[PDB]
Amino acid sequence: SVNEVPDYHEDIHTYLREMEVKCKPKVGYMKKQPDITNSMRAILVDWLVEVGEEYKLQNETLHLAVNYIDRFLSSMSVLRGKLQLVGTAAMLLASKFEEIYPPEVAEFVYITDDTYTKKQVLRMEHLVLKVLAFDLAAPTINQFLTQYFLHQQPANCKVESLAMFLGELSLIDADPYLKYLPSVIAAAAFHLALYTVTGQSWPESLVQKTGYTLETLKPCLLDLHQTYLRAPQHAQQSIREKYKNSKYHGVSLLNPPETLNVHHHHHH
């Protein structure tokens, strides 16, 4: 009903597609960062996932944080010892933007275990706002996933919580997911969820809402599938720990599919 906004869902979908492009971090930014690596970014995101749990924050909040962190590191060089500080202020800002009850600064300080002073956190906040020019309403995979769920027939929440898990996983690995847009990652995450639990595919109704064929999403599907398979062996485990509990239907305990099927797109 009006909570699915029947009169505006198109204008919204179009617009976020328009905005996801404009909010996309520069694809190969870590290579220009002298002191930090994609592995170090992998370590910081995981921490944020953990932070999101300690304070029962919206998954949405997590997703915006990573967006701010990514765009920040696209412009500003950051020493390893300060990476946590970027993250904290981002997590702080995304909280302020998205949470009904965002945690206080004191609490944000207290979790770095006094690596940084309150003064420093508030100052980084400002710096991040400057660097982003206050453009904090960035589209996330979540905002697309939520929209994609209304096409389900019928609505299955093992499918829902799995896609969440999968979309969340992609936040850990800059390589390769930086070359993918939120609408695309969400399209694969939803399809991969809708295959592991049910055996259905990326529904026709969405082919014409998005424009995404199962063909165009093939590159991203492969990477996701690979990441999904490699998940128990991945260094960062917080997301898997997160999605074990009854809340998200314990989807990270499920066994990923072996193959996915798929058409040879090119015919010789």
């Binding site: 009903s1 009006v2 909570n3 699915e4 906004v5 029947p6 009169d7 505006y8 869902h9 204008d11 919204i12 979908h13 617009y15 976020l16 905005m19 949405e60 702080l92 800002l93 302020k96 933007f97 009904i100 965002p102 206080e104 600064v105 956190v121 508030l122 906040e125 400002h126 706002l129 400057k130 020019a133 206050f134 453009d135 904090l136 309403a137 979540n142 905002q143 939520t146 929209q147 209304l150």
Partner: protein, 299 residues
């Protein structure tokens, strides 16, 4: 920083920060400055500013107030806005005895709807459409101001802050205590405003959460499963409420005609799902004759 802005006078305080009227010394432009202090203390930049800025940058529209600049010192934070000459209530009061010529009521509604449909089309709820937040210029334009209480929503929505909207313009679903509310809550508010321009008194000038509900019921009737499914399942709802029959609309929106009353009712529907959309309200026959008049006296 503000070395190029001379403060003329203070104009108000509504929501976060204080607003000054200022003049750009170099360009000659008259502007409105929103100023935030810090200290604060704190906690950093307020979620309300963060929200207003981010959204208001995305939102360029003839019927949404224009944010011109952000001056971002360590100590103060300035928001530079276009200056509008007065708020709608002010205005509505000035015309307490004379009234507002239909064309004009019609124009102001149309524009507020155009503006609000843009908001929703871009996944923004204002959540504070009191007539102090609707600003008018001398050329007959009206604009949505103060997005301090705004938010960007997901599709579908989720539970957002309960403590929301000025009591008078606050939709029943929020009053009742539902876990979800959407675009319609903004429409309810414009509905109340629509009436407020017509009769120049608040439609539901309630003095508390329960009394507000009481007044809404006094005027629109006490709702049940037929008109709005599930109302009895709602949290802060009570069966011990009296049962009022719906008041025939001429009492009390007397001067309003055939079409306006159709629209008004549609704007003031109980069921959030039934309620008209802004987009759908723009097509309504009430607006077929619309023009852009100039506000009568020197405002």
């Amino acid at each position: 920083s503000m070395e190029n802005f001379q403060k003329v006078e203070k104009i108000g305080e509504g929501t976060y920060g204080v607003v000054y009227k200022a003049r750009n010394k170099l360009t000659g432009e008259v502007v409105a400055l929103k100023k935030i202090r810090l200290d604060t203390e704190t906690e950093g930049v307020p979620s309300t500013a963060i929200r207003e800025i981010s959204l208001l940058k995305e939102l360029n529209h003839p019927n949404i107030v224009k944010l011109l600049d952000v001056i971002h010192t360590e100590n103060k934070l300035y928001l530079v806005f276009e200056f509008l000459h007065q708020d709608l209530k002010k205005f509505m009061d000035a015309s307490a005895l004379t009234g507002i010529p239909l064309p004009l009521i019609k124009s102001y509604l149309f524009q507020l709807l155009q503006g609000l449909a843009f908001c929703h089309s871009h996944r923004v709820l204002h959540r504070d459409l009191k007539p102090q937040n609707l600003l008018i210029n001398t050329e007959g334009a009206i604009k949505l101001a103060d997005f301090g209480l705004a938010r960007a929503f997901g599709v579908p929505v989720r539970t957002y802050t309960h403590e929301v909207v000025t009591l008078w313009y606050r939709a029943p679903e929020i009053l009742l205590g539902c876990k979800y509310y959407s675009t319609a809550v903004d429409i309810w508010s414009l509905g109340c405003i629509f009436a407020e321009m017509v009769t120049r008194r608040a439609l539901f000038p309630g003095d508390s959460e329960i009394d507000q509900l009481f007044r809404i019921f006094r005027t629109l009737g006490t709702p049940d499963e037929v008109v709005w499914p599930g109302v009895t399942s709602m949290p802060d709802y009570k069966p011990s409420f009296p049962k009022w029959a719906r008041q025939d609309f001429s009492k009390v929106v007397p001067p309003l005609d055939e079409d306006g009353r159709s629209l008004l009712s549609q704007m003031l529907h109980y069921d959030p799902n039934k309620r008209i959309s802004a987009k759908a309200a723009l097509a309504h026959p009430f607006f077929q004759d619309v023009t852009k008049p100039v506000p009568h006296l020197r405002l």
